[PDB]
Amino acid sequence: XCYXKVCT
Amino acid sequence: XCYXKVCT
Amino acid sequence: XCYXKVCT
Amino acid sequence: XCYXKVCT
Amino acid sequence: XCYXKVCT
Amino acid sequence: XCYXKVCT
Amino acid sequence: XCYXKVCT
Amino acid sequence: XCYXKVCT
């Protein structure tokens, strides 16, 4: 998913 | 951008 | 800093 | 490990 | 894989 | 770039 | 400097 | 050994 400023 | 397995 | 499971 | 600007 | 600044 | 067995 | 398994 | 700009 994404959170803060990182997506995987 | 992306690198390895993460986009930021 | 760190957040969730990453430090940047 | 770490790479670029992310450690996990 | 990648680590630091290199990918082998 | 890449050479031999490394990329940067 | 050196890290992991590479030196430069 | 070394090649290019790396020793491993």
The residue of chain B with its CA nearest to that of D6 is: B6
What are the strands of the beta sheet with H6-7, ordered from one edge?
G2-3, G6-7, H6-7, H2-3
Touch B-D: 3+ C-beta pairs under 8 A: yes
Q: What is the resolution of this structure in A?
A: 2.5
Assess contact for D8 and C5: CB atoms under 8 A: yes
F→E contacts (Cβ < 8 Å), by residue, are: 5-8
Q: Cα separation of F7 and G2, whole Å?
A: 16
Whether C contacts F, i.e. 3 or more CB pairs less than 8 A apart, is no
At D5, list the tokens.
């600007």
Query: Solved by what technique?
Result: cryo-EM
Q: Which of G1, H4, H1 is nearest to E4 (CA)?
A: G1
Nearest-angstrom CA–CA distance, B7 and C8: 13
